[PDB]
Amino acid sequence: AMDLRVGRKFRIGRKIGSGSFGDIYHGTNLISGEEVAIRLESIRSRHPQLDYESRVYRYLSGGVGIPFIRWFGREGEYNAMVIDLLGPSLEDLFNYCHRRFSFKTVIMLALQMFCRIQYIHGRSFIHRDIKPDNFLMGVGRRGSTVHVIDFGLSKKYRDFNTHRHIPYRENKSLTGTARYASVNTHLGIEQSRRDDLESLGYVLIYFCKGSLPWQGLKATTKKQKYDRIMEKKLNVSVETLCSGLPLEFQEYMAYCKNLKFDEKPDYLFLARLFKDLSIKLEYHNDHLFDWTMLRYTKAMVEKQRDLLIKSETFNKIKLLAMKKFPTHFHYYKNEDKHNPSPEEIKQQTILNNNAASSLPEELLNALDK
Amino acid sequence: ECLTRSNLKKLQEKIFDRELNDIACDHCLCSTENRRDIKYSRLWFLFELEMSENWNENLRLSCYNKYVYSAIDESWKMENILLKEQEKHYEYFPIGQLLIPN
Ligand SMILES: [Zn+2]
């Protein structure tokens, strides 16, 4: 009774998440011990999507950062989809880092996210649900790699036989998440490649600033809320939206919002923007994200703390990480309304170096390492 | 044997009872005091437990699998994911980030 299986090959373990489709469980291959994730969807659902997703995943298989489907089918009253076990989502890690990412991490993420979207588009699909929650790090030695999930709203944007782009259509309903939805999605215009990239832009700005200007708008109904987010999006300039950020972000948003409906994005131009920014800031390609260094610093500190024996405790760990890796941790400043230069941003390196730390005894121990 | 809402619920109750009460190591990251700090269980189970105290196995294998899954069924197999290759279409993963010092 404690041995519950899917596809006769996988064993269900700990619940690791819960979506609108249903729940997600850790699992293991019974023969190899390989770790998997198992998604269960009740056949009683009014909006079944797991069958559809499994076909889109299989169609996209082989792309870098596309989860591999191991199995899909019925098990009792559920449909079950077995895929690669992945790590936390970028929204999860955003919370881990107390909801600000450094420029180095935002750039590292942007570059991988560009490749994922470019790959999906090259397979004739648009994702249509771009948000931090749908990008996940791998586990083990896949832990440096961003993966994309949730193809429930994805659709083909061009006909296979003719490569004819889908027709421009209106009156379409807003089907994704409102916070990251493109303006044209609010207008009820058919989404195309440009909309995935515009939404990605909103995600990147959100990572930098901690929030987007259309969060926290209050409304009496759902349609009211969507419309108010729409009006906010329509009326914030790219200049305003990207204030305080390197000019690259504004250039990215202006490009994406300027794309015609059926136009192929210049993905290489977008990547070059951020690659060049990374070079200007002299960020080393070392595969160290904010959370990489925070997790490591925390483990090392807490172990020393234990030998010796909140947000404040986290902030102390963050301060220590920033002193140890001073060239890695550069942040957006809420006060800035201009676009900082690379030298201006790199001033924070010196700040991080000289940042005072609270605990004398523990530090002496960390030094003596 | 058959997958039902009720069998699933009962399995999860046993798993979480072991998880909450019976992980008997003394590792800071495994501890209930560490877990109490985090709100999103995936940041613990799929992120902090990627770390390795003994530099051979991660904590999900050395501790979670030992005190939870193995406690439920001794034959419950979990591989060592750190013994896998650095795979061709994946970003380089610096293994040092997992190796807990001291
Ligand atoms: Zn442990």
Side-chain angles (χ1 to χ4, degrees), chain A residues 34-309:
Chain A
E34 188 184 0
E35 296 188 274
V36 292
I38 303 173
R39 278 165 174 76
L40 295 187
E41 181 182 67
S42 169
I43 46 159
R44 288 172 200 146
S45 170
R46 298 286 191 270
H47 315 277
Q49 67 177 58
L50 222 42
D51 189 342
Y52 181 70
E53 286 197 69
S54 74
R55 295 291 298 274
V56 174
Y57 275 119
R58 288 192 147 121
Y59 181 81
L60 298 178
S61 67
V64 181
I66 304 291
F68 183 60
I69 303 284
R70 320 299 182 85
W71 194 82
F72 171 82
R74 287 275 299 275
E75 289 288 343
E77 53 189 305
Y78 300 93
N79 279 308
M81 188 178 72
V82 184
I83 66 153
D84 305 350
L85 175 70
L86 303 170
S89 69
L90 299 184
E91 175 70 15
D92 291 329
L93 293 161
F94 195 53
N95 284 319
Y96 190 85
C97 296
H98 284 37
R99 300 189 67 78
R100 300 289 179 101
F101 282 160
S102 73
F103 291 125
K104 177 177 190 291
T105 276
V106 170
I107 289 168
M108 290 165 79
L109 287 172
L111 292 174
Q112 288 198 48
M113 293 164 96
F114 294 156
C115 291
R116 304 301 170 260
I117 295 178
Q118 182 175 6
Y119 173 76
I120 294 165
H121 291 179
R123 300 307 309 279
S124 299
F125 271 88
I126 50 185
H127 188 279
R128 303 207 304 150
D129 193 20
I130 301 298
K131 60 188 182 183
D133 317 67
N134 287 342
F135 290 95
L136 279 60
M137 302 311 293
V139 288
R141 300 183 189 265
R142 299 181 178 187
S144 295
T145 306
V146 176
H147 297 66
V148 50
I149 65 163
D150 199 349
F151 288 84
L153 302 173
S154 69
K155 64 177 292 191
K156 298 186 175 182
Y157 68 88
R158 65 183 175 194
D159 178 78
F160 176 82
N161 285 345
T162 63
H163 256 29
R164 187 171 316 172
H165 198 285
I166 48 174
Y168 175 92
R169 283 197 43 169
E170 299 191 11
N171 312 336
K172 297 298 211 183
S173 309
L174 196 149
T175 215
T177 308
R179 189 191 294 172
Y180 310 102
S182 69
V183 167
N184 284 325
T185 296
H186 284 276
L187 295 175
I189 299 177
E190 188 77 88
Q191 301 170 239
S192 62
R193 286 171 288 192
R194 62 183 180 175
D195 300 284
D196 284 345
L197 291 175
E198 180 178 334
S199 295
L200 177 55
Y202 295 143
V203 172
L204 297 174
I205 294 160
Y206 164 85
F207 285 162
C208 289
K209 299 197 166 192
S211 63
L212 291 161
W214 38 87
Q215 289 178 249
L217 309 177
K218 301 201 167 178
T220 315
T221 163
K222 167 173 167 181
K223 171 64 184 190
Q224 262 195 66
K225 182 138 304 177
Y226 281 11
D227 278 356
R228 300 207 172 168
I229 294 171
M230 173 188 66
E231 180 160 308
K232 191 69 175 187
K233 283 179 184 172
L234 278 171
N235 287 263
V236 170
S237 72
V238 287
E239 290 83 359
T240 301
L241 182 63
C242 296
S243 62
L245 304 176
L247 204 64
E248 280 80 5
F249 288 84
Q250 181 189 304
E251 295 185 62
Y252 176 95
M253 288 301 313
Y255 177 84
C256 290
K257 299 226 297 193
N258 188 41
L259 287 173
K260 303 309 185 179
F261 175 67
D262 58 5
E263 183 176 358
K264 174 159 75 214
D266 188 342
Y267 305 94
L268 184 61
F269 164 75
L270 299 181
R272 183 45 56 188
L273 246 29
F274 289 85
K275 278 193 259 224
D276 282 354
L277 180 56
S278 195
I279 289 165
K280 290 186 194 188
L281 290 168
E282 289 186 346
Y283 291 148
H284 12 240
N285 194 16
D286 53 10
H287 294 90
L288 301 183
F289 304 91
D290 296 347
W291 53 84
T292 315
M293 291 169 285
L294 288 167
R295 175 181 57 178
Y296 189 85
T297 300
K298 171 182 176 183
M300 164 176 36
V301 166
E302 291 301 345
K303 195 167 186 171
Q304 296 269 356
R305 172 165 286 173
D306 197 315
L307 303 194
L308 225 50
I309 69 176

Side-chain angles (χ1 to χ4, degrees), chain A residues 316-334:
Chain A
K316 291 191 180 186
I317 286 180
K318 182 183 175 174
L319 266 43
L320 187 44
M322 292 178 313
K323 178 171 179 179
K324 297 187 184 206
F325 307 93
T327 69
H328 286 72
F329 283 98
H330 302 150
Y331 289 100
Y332 161 81
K333 304 186 167 185
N334 297 257

Side-chain angles (χ1 to χ4, degrees), chain B residues 23 25-27 29-31 53 59 62-64 67:
Chain B
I23 301 176
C25 67
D26 288 324
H27 306 136
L29 292 182
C30 296
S31 71
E53 284 274 0
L59 298 166
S62 70
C63 294
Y64 196 96
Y67 290 106

